[PDB]
Design a protein around this nucleic acid. Sequence first.
DNA 1: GTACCGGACGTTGC
DNA 2: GCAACGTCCGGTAC
Length: 136
Amino acid sequence: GSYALGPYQISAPQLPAYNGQTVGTFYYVNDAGGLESKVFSSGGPTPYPNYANAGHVAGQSALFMRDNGISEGLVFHNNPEGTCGFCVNMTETLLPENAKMTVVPPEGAIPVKRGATGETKVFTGNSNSPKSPHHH
DNA sequence: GTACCGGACGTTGC
DNA sequence: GCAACGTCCGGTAC
Ligand SMILES: [Mg+2]
Ligand SMILES: [Zn+2]
């Protein structure tokens, strides 16, 4: 159960036991060839409150990639119900065009609501961008 | 406490 | 083609 990030072959790191708030670890490769990690916890403040997936682990990872121009990313999260339907449908919007982010739920994740998946998904970014919000 | 609410994208039942 | 449907989000309301 390992995943290819450039020349690195990475498996799931130890994540906190799911307490209701999803937590994930994100990995990318910097300009020097080294591997960098960053820990994300779902549901902080966000530039895109009009995007239901922006505050999730995969959404924060995608905005971190867009913001920093990262072309390829890997992220593991701890949610036994899997990646939700908003993530599945909106990450490619959040992503910059042709960026690749693979999202890995915990082993044996079982989706229970519409749209969710318990399987690894590889999102590739599309030319659309997140609409900037308003004060409704 | 709790049952919607609300922007938003793609999926899909009618 | 139209509209239901999907977060634990943050927010108003029974
Ligand atoms: Mg996009
Ligand atoms: Zn999600």
